[PDB]
Amino acid sequence: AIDLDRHHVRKHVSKTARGNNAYMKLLVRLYGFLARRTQSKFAKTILHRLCLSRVNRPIVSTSKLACLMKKHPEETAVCVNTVTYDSRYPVPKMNVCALKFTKTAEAAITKAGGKCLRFDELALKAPTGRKTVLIRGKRNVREALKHFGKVCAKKNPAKQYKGKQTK
Amino acid sequence: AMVKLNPYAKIASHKLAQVAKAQAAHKAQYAAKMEKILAAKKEALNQSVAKRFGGKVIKVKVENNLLKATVKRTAKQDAYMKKYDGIVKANAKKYAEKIGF
Amino acid sequence: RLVDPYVTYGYPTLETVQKLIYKRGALKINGNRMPITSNCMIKKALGDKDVVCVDDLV
RNA sequence: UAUAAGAAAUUAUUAAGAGCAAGAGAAUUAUUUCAUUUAUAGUGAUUAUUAAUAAACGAGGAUUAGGAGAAAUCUUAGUAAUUGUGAAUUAAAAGUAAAAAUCCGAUAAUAAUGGAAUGAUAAAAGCUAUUUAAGGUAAGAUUAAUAAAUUUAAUCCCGAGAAUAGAAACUCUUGAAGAAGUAAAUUAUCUACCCGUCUUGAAACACGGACCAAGGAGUCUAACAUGGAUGCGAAUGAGAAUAGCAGGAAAGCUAUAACAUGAAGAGAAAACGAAAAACUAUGAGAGUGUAGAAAUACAUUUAGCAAUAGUAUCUUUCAA
RNA sequence: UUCCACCUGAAUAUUCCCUUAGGAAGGUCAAAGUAUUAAUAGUAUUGAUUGGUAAAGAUAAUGAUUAGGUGUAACAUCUUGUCAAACUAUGAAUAAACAAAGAAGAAUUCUCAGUGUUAAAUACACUUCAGGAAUUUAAAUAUAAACAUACUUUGAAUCGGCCAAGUCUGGUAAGCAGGACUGGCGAUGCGGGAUGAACCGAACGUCGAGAUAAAGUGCCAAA
RNA sequence: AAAAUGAAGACAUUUUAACGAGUAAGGAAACGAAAUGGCGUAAGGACAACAAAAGUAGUAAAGAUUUAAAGUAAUUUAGAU
């Protein structure tokens, strides 16, 4: 035998779209083709983010796009996730590419003069990515993250799953 | 596969081919030199085995110069050979003194 | 010295280094233990280190 | 539709005939390897050529009566001081200090010849020949100066690259009268303790098990959580009850809708109820230039998401 | 306590329990899911340390202890022999924790602000060595490390252990009881020791050919 | 594991390299380069001769017994009675 540190186990990185969605399966095929041929780090990033699970693809509201594109006028927002609508604040003019658009978010983006694009048009127009802004949504805002750990802890207590006789 | 990895091997092979042939020829000629040197040694021994032959005819003492030269050398070479012998004996005395402590 | 009971070692000669690399030589390329077959693969790996063939390797 | 390719069939001859499989070879080889033989730049020892001094050692000295050995010619045996051997040393001769053999060292390799296991069959960065010429660092050769030299110079040699041209497509044995392989039974060599379980440890003198068939043991309801797939998303559900529709229907479709969870949090409670339209660090991505040069490697311009940590500011509390 | 192949693969510490045939926190383990990642080390070297073990000592402190001189039994004093788990001046080997260039790879020059310290500061302290601009720059032990490294969540089983020894304690001693470090068996087959859980060699997909390891070469039994 | 290729070929692609012991235990399904791969029992919804008679079956079903073949195996397939 050979004195190895550890034996070969599957690498914990997803290499394909999860689930049986036919359209998401093709997008991974499209960007897997672009990443291999163009060898652009943009396509490798989009391909990697297409394979994340639903909880690792957090939503991005229109207010986040509005703030992140204030100094990028002739640019395209590229978020590999659903784009929701922040009804509290107005939507300026901007181009957004996303997997999914909320019905109220798409109406607000289009009414302001912007365009809601999908990832097939973005690859057609900007395959390597030239006037794009990469955006991902916040991950620590999940209310499940509050209960992780020990609530008796002295530094960062958990949040005590509610149940019997919770005061 | 050697040539694809070490293209210099063709040159080195030819040099080794030269040396092997040259050493064989050098060995062949020297073997001839000893054949007549030993033959000259043989005839002196057969000449001096007449010491067995015999009025107080006592103590056959044998000739000192019964061995004959087989390869001829110039005056400088004959003088240098004696000098070389003296050098060799000095090293033998030098090595023995060191080892003998 | 600390690992003496588990190894043996010494000082190699030129011929030992030659025969070891020529017969058992291999390079780690892209995580793969590829044996030495040509000088082109040696140049691709160690070319930046001014090593282009199997003799500079030796 | 133009071109070699040119299949089948046919004609004259004979070195006159399959497929597949197994076995034995032939020629040239790939990886690994066995056996035998062959050189290992030891200045190691010995390998009859003469003579001398020896540090040690025992014996021997001056007539054929009886023999040994040899065709020798020359020795051997035994009934008061000449001589025998010899480690080491030394002179002259020979010897340019590489022959062969053995021992002591040193290494283990080039190669050649026979095989073995797994293959391959094709032309070569094959090999061979012819040209010009990088090179040969003791050692390719001969020379000369000398010389304890892997020191010098000279001309002869051979010759890498490159260019020009060439040469490989084979035999035999066995098999539907049964090949190769496979299976069954027997024999032989090697090999093999009773399963399940508890246990540090059972083949155990630990327990259950005489044998066979069929049955036989992580399920259902309810609450919470994490996580993978899915719909919608500041909303989601509204197969809450319930009310209607066509169709006759425990199925399906429709109902601006109570409420649940969430969008706001802290406090026992009274009483309250979130911006400096944020800041700092590292960080995803996008362009250009140059070069290696095949991919790629450096310089430079811009961007700053996620995450983490830290800051101001704000809500509630005795206390953040 | 009922099908197969494949991959990874344990445990007997610590805390609490009316706890001792059992639980929960935690360690070891698996599966899922991430991050370009101030986020490598059961190693050595160099440098500055820490410790009080082995050893050593015994008119060096505490304690134990045999004898002999000299001066005034005794006491001083100079020697002598032998000692300490609850004695120590001194003190290793093996070790422990640092450094060997991450406010993000150096450095220098110029400019430089807010608070405070201060007698006052232009000194000093903290503020991304506040901040800002130029120039220079990839250097600073060895070795290894991108299927590296850092992990996050969820969860299983387990916490009766036993063995070895250039180790220790109780015991006359034990195949006895209990420990420190490591390697094992448990969970593990194979070659050898005739036989054997733990010894020695060496860890295992199905095979062919070779060199081997422990150990062997009269026969059983290969040599 | 990494490269290459990728609308359907096929054997769950091609090449290269490393690796493969194991009690308790874990690895649900789906996921084209698949986040392990499969065998078996029964029932339900579909599909099963594409040109208007559309899986097999009195020209012999299921079952039983054996003989051979495929698969590492769970098992499957076919012949004869």
Scanning B49-74, the segments in alpha helix (DSSP H) are none
Q: What DSSP string runs through chain A?
A: ----SS-----S---S-SSS-HHHHHHHHHHHHHHHHT--HHHHHHHHHHTS-GGGS--EEHHHHHHHTTT-TT-EEEEEEEEE--TTS---S-EEEEEEE-HHHHHHHHHTT-EEE-HHHHHHH-SS-SSEEE----STT-GGGGG-S-TT-SSS-------TT--
Taking residue A88's Cβ as centre, other Cβ atoms within 10 Å add up to 7
Q: Is C3 helix (H, G, I), strand (E, B) or coil?
A: coil
Contacts of C36 in chain B (CB under 8 A): 5
What's the burial of A43, exposed, middle or buried (CB within 10 Å: 0-12/13-18/19+)? buried
Q: From CA A23, how far away is CA A27, in angstroms rounded?
A: 6
Experimental method: cryo-EM
CA B35 from centroid of its chain's CA atoms? 11
CA distance A68 to A83: 14
Cα–Cα distance between C23 and A127 in angstroms, integer?
A: 48
Return the number of other C-beta atoms located less than 10 Å from residue A79's C-beta: 23
Hey, are the CB atoms on C53 and B1 less than 8 Å from each other? no
- H helices of chain B, in order, are 2-5, 9-48, 75-99
Give chain C's contact residues with B (Cβ, < 8 Å).
Answer: 22, 36-39, 53-55
Instruction: List the resolution, Å.
Output: 2.8
What SS3 class is residue C35? strand
B4 vs C contacts (CB less than 8 Å): 37-39
Alpha carbon A64 to chain centroid, angstroms: 13
CB contact under 8 Å between B6 and C38, yes or no, is no
Which residue in this structure is represented by tokens 């958990």? A158
Does nucleic acid strand E have an atom less than 7 angstroms from the CB of A56? yes
Q: Are residues A154 and A96 in contact, defined by beta-carbon separation less than 8 angstroms?
A: no
Which phi and psi (to 5°) does residue A60 adopt?
-130, 115
Residues 74-103 of A with CB under 7 A from strand F: none
Distance CA C18, CA B15 (A): 19
* Chain C residues in contact with B8 (beta carbon < 8 A): 55
For residue C10, give both structure tokens. Answer: 């010494």
B interface with C, Cβ–Cβ below 8 Å:
1, 4-6, 8
CB-strand contact A53/E, under 7 Å: yes
In degrees and rounded to multiples of 5, residue C16 shows phi and psi of -65, -45
Going by their DSSP bridges, the two strands A60-61 and A95-101 should be labelled as unpaired
Distance (Å, rounded) from C-alpha A25 to C-alpha A46?
13
Backbone torsions φ then ψ of A78, nearest 5 degrees: -125, 100
| DSSP strand pairing (A132-134 vs A76-84) | parallel
